[PDB]
Amino acid sequence: MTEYKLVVVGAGGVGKSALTIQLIQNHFVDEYDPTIEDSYRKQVVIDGETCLLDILDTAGQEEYSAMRDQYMRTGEGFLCVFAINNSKSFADINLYREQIKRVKDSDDVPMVLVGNKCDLPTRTVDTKQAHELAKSYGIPFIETSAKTRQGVEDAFYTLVREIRQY
Ligand SMILES: Nc1nc2c(ncn2[C@@H]2O[C@H](COP(=O)(O)OP(=O)(O)NP(=O)(O)O)[C@@H](O)[C@H]2O)c(=O)[nH]1
Ligand SMILES: [Mg+2]
């Protein structure tokens, strides 16, 4: 079947793993558990197409930058994740996108900007700034909560559709 190689990147603790576990295992981890490098493979049906999501869950820690570069050269689509209560994770978004552009030798690779933890009451990133940044990249912005599952399918399925239209 068709396989979509997806890569989830972003600063430490924004909820990269929580989003993937919500998508694949239908629950929210709610635990401290830093990632080195995890892969998830799940057969799905998206818009009638039987396909395999091959999801690389990456580390936000700086020491694993080189491992990221190598391991995400095969990515067809990228979720670039920040948390809505972490202004520095939003500031870091541009750095992950630029790293993706250099490893993919491309400036329009399928990508979704994901603003996670929208269930929280303590917002520090303004929605308007995220929409404006997404529009300056030419990519969708999707707000998510790995806790409530809001937007989770939307984020991953939208990325697959970006890949289809590339
Ligand atoms: N309230 C809330 N907490 C969340 C959400 N997503 C993740 N968290 C919490 O935020 C923390 C970090 O989540 P995690 O998924 O491990 O983040 P990560 O980006 O994968 N970290 P790393 O880069 O180290 O692998 C955990 O305590 C997790 O339960 C969310 O949508 N809402
Ligand atoms: Mg993780």
Q: How many CA atoms lie within 13 A of 112 on its CB side?
A: 26
Specified resolution (Å): 1.7
Q: How far is CA 152 from CA 12, 62, 65, 70, in A?
A: 19, 26, 25, 26
Question: DSSP label at 108?
Answer: S
Q: Which two tokens stand for residue 48?
A: 């009638």
Q: Which residue's alpha carbon is nearest to atom 13 within ligand 1? A: 15
Question: Domains, the chain, ranges and CATH?
Answer: 1-166 (3.40.50.300)
Ligand 1 centroid–CA 61 distance in Å is: 13
Query: Ligand 1, residues 21, 24, 29: which to mutate, most atoms within 8 A of Cβ?
Result: 29
Kind plus residue range of the DSSP H or E element containing 113: strand 111-116
Angle in degrees, CA 107, 67, 55, rounded to 5:
70
